[PDB]
Design an enzyme around this catalytic site. Structure first.
Site, mmCIF file in Angstrom:
data_model
loop_
_atom_site.group_PDB
_atom_site.id
_atom_site.type_symbol
_atom_site.label_atom_id
_atom_site.label_comp_id
_atom_site.label_asym_id
_atom_site.label_seq_id
_atom_site.Cartn_x
_atom_site.Cartn_y
_atom_site.Cartn_z
ATOM 1 N N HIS A 288 0.807 -1.254 0.000
ATOM 2 C CA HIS A 288 0.000 0.000 0.000
ATOM 3 C C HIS A 288 0.829 1.288 0.000
ATOM 4 O O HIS A 288 0.254 2.347 -0.353
ATOM 5 C CB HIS A 288 -1.201 0.052 1.006
ATOM 6 C CG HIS A 288 -0.700 0.197 2.440
ATOM 7 N ND1 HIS A 288 -0.401 -0.935 3.201
ATOM 8 C CD2 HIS A 288 -0.344 1.302 3.112
ATOM 9 C CE1 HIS A 288 0.192 -0.477 4.377
ATOM 10 N NE2 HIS A 288 0.213 0.903 4.325
ATOM 11 N N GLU B 190 19.359 7.743 7.465
ATOM 12 C CA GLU B 190 18.580 8.828 8.101
ATOM 13 C C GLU B 190 18.529 8.696 9.611
ATOM 14 O O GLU B 190 18.131 7.608 10.076
ATOM 15 C CB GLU B 190 17.094 8.863 7.667
ATOM 16 C CG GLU B 190 16.976 9.208 6.152
ATOM 17 C CD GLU B 190 17.328 10.673 5.964
ATOM 18 O OE1 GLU B 190 17.019 11.296 4.909
ATOM 19 O OE2 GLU B 190 17.659 11.328 6.973
ATOM 20 N N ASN C 298 17.445 12.286 11.543
ATOM 21 C CA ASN C 298 16.587 13.415 11.230
ATOM 22 C C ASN C 298 16.187 13.505 9.753
ATOM 23 O O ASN C 298 17.000 13.922 8.891
ATOM 24 C CB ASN C 298 17.269 14.711 11.659
ATOM 25 C CG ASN C 298 16.246 15.849 11.746
ATOM 26 O OD1 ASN C 298 15.333 16.034 10.906
ATOM 27 N ND2 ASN C 298 16.601 16.811 12.525
ATOM 28 N N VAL D 292 16.852 17.006 8.307
ATOM 29 C CA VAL D 292 18.030 17.809 7.972
ATOM 30 C C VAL D 292 19.084 16.851 7.471
ATOM 31 O O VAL D 292 18.936 15.638 7.755
ATOM 32 C CB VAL D 292 18.583 18.726 9.116
ATOM 33 C CG1 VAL D 292 17.554 18.970 10.219
ATOM 34 C CG2 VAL D 292 19.897 18.278 9.741
ATOM 35 N N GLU E 106 23.604 10.305 4.934
ATOM 36 C CA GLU E 106 22.627 9.834 3.982
ATOM 37 C C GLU E 106 23.151 9.294 2.642
ATOM 38 O O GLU E 106 24.182 9.709 2.081
ATOM 39 C CB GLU E 106 21.589 10.946 3.745
ATOM 40 C CG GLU E 106 20.840 11.319 5.044
ATOM 41 C CD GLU E 106 21.511 12.467 5.825
ATOM 42 O OE1 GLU E 106 22.698 12.840 5.597
ATOM 43 O OE2 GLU E 106 20.733 13.311 6.311
ATOM 44 N N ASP F 79 1.738 2.085 20.014
ATOM 45 C CA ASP F 79 1.470 1.442 18.698
ATOM 46 C C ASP F 79 2.328 1.978 17.530
ATOM 47 O O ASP F 79 3.074 2.986 17.629
ATOM 48 C CB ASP F 79 0.016 1.673 18.379
ATOM 49 C CG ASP F 79 -0.592 0.591 17.505
ATOM 50 O OD1 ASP F 79 -1.803 0.623 17.228
ATOM 51 O OD2 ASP F 79 0.089 -0.316 17.014
ATOM 52 N N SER F 80 2.001 1.512 16.368
ATOM 53 C CA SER F 80 2.498 2.174 15.185
ATOM 54 C C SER F 80 1.380 2.981 14.531
ATOM 55 O O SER F 80 0.183 2.701 14.756
ATOM 56 C CB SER F 80 3.105 1.122 14.222
ATOM 57 O OG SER F 80 2.137 0.130 13.958
ATOM 58 N N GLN G 15 0.123 6.166 11.225
ATOM 59 C CA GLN G 15 0.336 6.856 9.945
ATOM 60 C C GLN G 15 1.746 7.421 9.792
ATOM 61 O O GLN G 15 2.284 8.107 10.676
ATOM 62 C CB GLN G 15 -0.735 7.926 9.618
ATOM 63 C CG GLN G 15 -2.091 7.354 9.160
ATOM 64 C CD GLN G 15 -2.689 6.450 10.245
ATOM 65 O OE1 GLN G 15 -2.920 6.959 11.356
ATOM 66 N NE2 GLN G 15 -3.391 5.426 9.842
ATOM 67 N N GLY G 16 2.421 6.975 8.758
ATOM 68 C CA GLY G 16 3.820 7.313 8.533
ATOM 69 C C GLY G 16 4.717 6.084 8.651
ATOM 70 O O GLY G 16 5.924 6.188 8.308
ATOM 71 N N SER H 61 3.987 2.758 8.107
ATOM 72 C CA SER H 61 3.772 1.667 7.122
ATOM 73 C C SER H 61 4.984 1.286 6.249
ATOM 74 O O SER H 61 5.819 2.160 5.969
ATOM 75 C CB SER H 61 2.761 2.155 6.130
ATOM 76 O OG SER H 61 1.530 1.603 6.430
ATOM 77 N N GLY H 62 5.146 0.017 5.923
ATOM 78 C CA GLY H 62 6.313 -0.539 5.231
ATOM 79 C C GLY H 62 7.534 -0.788 6.080
ATOM 80 O O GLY H 62 8.328 -1.673 5.692
#
Ligand SMILES: CC[C@H](C)[C@H](N)C(=O)N[C@H](C(=O)O)C(C)C
Ligand SMILES: [Ca+2]
Lengths: 223, 58
Positions: A40, A52, A54, A57, A62, A171-172, A174-175, A177-178
């Protein structure tokens, strides 16, 4: 007590951000060229960020690499969310170091009450909104199938499991996922869905990664 | 114009953070909101323009 804590910079080195102009999903590095995520989470014009902490910034560790290919499981069901798994091939191989490192796939499935780490840049408020700059971590146990199926009657397939606390607040969301659920070093789950976040008697639902290991290895090998 | 256009935005049960558009009948414009990746309803557009073309005038 709040569930999340700040993992600490580069402590979950297999965690990746999926970016399309902003962080929309997470994922796990399985080798230097392949990422696993949720079905999804499929979009065009994915950039994967590795190393990553932050996400707002540029901290010097990275690697931003584009995807060449995105493969959603052949039997992904958009309605039922069964087979909510997808592989992403990186345009070029990552360079694997100490902040960027891949996670082993499981040899067997984990039992109820195995304690896992779930990590993400998703919302930190159960009811509310607040997206963190740094990566958050949560230790949450795997739940029994029977309790999972009581939490969500009619909806749990053999390819899902529940993890967390029936009480709520941890919990986990929105954001997230995956992104990974890693238990005793092995990648057991993928952040997938729930009824809201961190609500009592509704623990999160996660894609059961031990069912897909043959599919992953063969899809990786031939693409 | 329509009646799905009056419906409040639905995030649903999946945990992605994907920015979408919905028609906000109270404001008379399309606004952004967080769609979690699955089970979308019909007031849920990929760009303001798609929103405005389908809904603007509801
Ligand atoms: C899984 C990554 C973290 C722990 C998520 N996004 C989080 O902050 N969840 C809150 C918690 O403290 O467990 C929850 C929504 C209250
Ligand atoms: Ca950064």
């Amino acid at each position: 007590i709040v569930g999340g804590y700040t993992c600490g910079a580069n402590t979950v080195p297999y965690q990746v951000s999926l970016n399309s102009g902003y962080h929309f999903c997470g994922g796990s590095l399985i080798n230097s060229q392949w990422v696993v995520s949720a079905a999804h989470c499929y979009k065009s014009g994915i950039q994967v960020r590795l190393g990553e902490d932050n996400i707002n910034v540029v901290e010097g560790n990275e690697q931003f690499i584009s995807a060449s290919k995105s493969i959603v499981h052949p039997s992904y069901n958009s309605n039922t969310l069964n087979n909510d798994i997808m592989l992403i091939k990186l345009k070029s191989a990552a360079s694997l170091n100490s902040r960027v490192a891949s996670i082993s796939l499981p040899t067997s499935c984990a039992s109820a009450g195995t304690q896992c780490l779930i990590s993400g840049w998703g919302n930190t408020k159960s009811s509310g909104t607040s997206y963190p700059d740094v990566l958050k971590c949560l230790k949450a146990p795997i739940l029994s199938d029977s309790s999972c199926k009581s939490a969500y009657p009619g909806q749990i397939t053999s390819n899902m499991f529940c993890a967390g606390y029936l009480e709520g607040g941890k919990d986990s969301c929105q954001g997230d996922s995956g992104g990974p659920v890693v238990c005793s070093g092995k990648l057991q789950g993928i952040v997938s869905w729930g009824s809201g976040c961190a609500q009592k008697n509704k623990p999160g639902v996660y894609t059961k990664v031990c069912n897909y290991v043959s599919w992953i290895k063969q899809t990786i090998a031939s693409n | 114009r329509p009646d799905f256009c009056l419906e409040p935005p639905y995030t649903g049960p999946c945990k992605a953070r994907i920015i979408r558009y919905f028609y906000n009948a109270k404001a008379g414009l399309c606004q952004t909101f967080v769609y979690g990746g699955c089970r979308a309803k019909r007031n849920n557009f990929k760009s303001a323009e798609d929103c405005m073309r389908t809904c603007g005038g509801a």
